[PDB]
């Protein structure tokens, strides 16, 4: 049986979705045809407008309590949620704000999975200078008094293995709970499976670091600490997993910017200034 998924986008850049399209364990064709039943996703679905929204609401009721609500992007609460209009319901008028959609759907979901640092912690849309009242899913849940299992799979964007891995583990648990456990989460609600490791501790440049050998420039040898690397205060398994099918990763190429952390970007800024 395939895991039903309703994927909604608020204040997102579609980067989390594109990162998922790059998956290799398994590849995207297998994910869509064998693993999940992607019922609603604005970027790739065949239907549009009223037909798309009606199908989503149809699935939310028929699969009430049995679909994963995936959230990409932050939730803006200022100006009555008007900074993010996700749709227009057929029943004469009725523009639906992201606030309304999440308030409606989240209680009917099996669990809400906030993919990306935006939905999980607020991220860039919620950074200093915004005037949209941008909120993370967890902060919105608290404000709304929503009592629902919420798994945070951060990263800007999250590596596809983290997203797919978290969802497969969660679905196996739904199918046979006494035999398949839910991913163990840290205090920020993210899977220890992928976010338990410290980048710096697992970094290949660690010996250079310990011997005070720092690259004075992006193109000079040595640890990237002086270039602004935030690996010391960042927890993700990037140093072992790497990116884009093991082709390269942020630290080898430049510096880690701490994209998976709740305080990204403000707490990791300036990006090119050493921690």
């Amino acid at each position: 049986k395939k895991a039903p998924v309703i994927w909604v986008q608020g204040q997102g850049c579609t980067g989390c979705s594109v990162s998922l399209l790059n998956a290799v364990h398994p590849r995207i064709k297998e994910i869509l045809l064998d693993v999940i039943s992607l019922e609603f996703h604005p970027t790739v679905m065949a239907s549009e407008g009223e037909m798309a929204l009606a199908h989503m609401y149809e699935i939310a009721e028929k699969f009430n309590g049995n679909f994963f609500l995936l959230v990409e992007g932050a939730i803006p609460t200022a100006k009555e949620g008007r900074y993010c209009i996700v749709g227009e319901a057929k029943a004469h008028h009725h523009e639906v704000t992201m606030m309304e959609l999440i308030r409606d759907l989240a209680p009917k979901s099996l669990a809400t999975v906030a993919v990306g640092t935006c939905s999980a912690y607020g991220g860039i849309p919620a950074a200093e200078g915004n005037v949209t009242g941008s909120k993370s899913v967890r902060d919105f849940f608290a404000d709304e008094k929503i009592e629902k299992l919420l798994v945070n799979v951060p990263g800007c964007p999250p590596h596809p293995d983290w997203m797919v891995g978290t969802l497969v583990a969660a679905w196996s648990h739904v199918l046979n709970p006494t035999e398949h456990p839910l991913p163990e989460l840290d205090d920020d609600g993210r899977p220890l499976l992928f976010f338990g490791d410290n980048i710096h501790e697992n970094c290949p440049y660690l010996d250079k670091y310990d011997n005070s050998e720092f690259a004075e420039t992006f193109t000079k040898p040595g640890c990237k600490a002086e270039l602004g690397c935030k690996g010391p205060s960042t927890y993700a398994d990037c140093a072992k997993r790497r990116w884009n099918n093991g082709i390269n990763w942020c630290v080898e190429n430049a510096v880690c910017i701490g994209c998976v952390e709740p305080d990204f970007p403000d707490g990791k800024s300036p990006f090119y200034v050493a921690e």
Binding site: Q11, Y83, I124, N130, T132
Partner: peptide, 24 residues
């Protein structure tokens, strides 16, 4: 129908950060 305000968010930042921020 969706606004984030990057031109507002970037204000006061180290100019070099923009190449990472604007990617989002």
């Amino acid at each position: 129908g969706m606004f984030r305000g990057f031109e507002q968010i970037l204000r006061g930042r180290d100019p070099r950060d923009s190449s990472q921020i604007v990617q989002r």
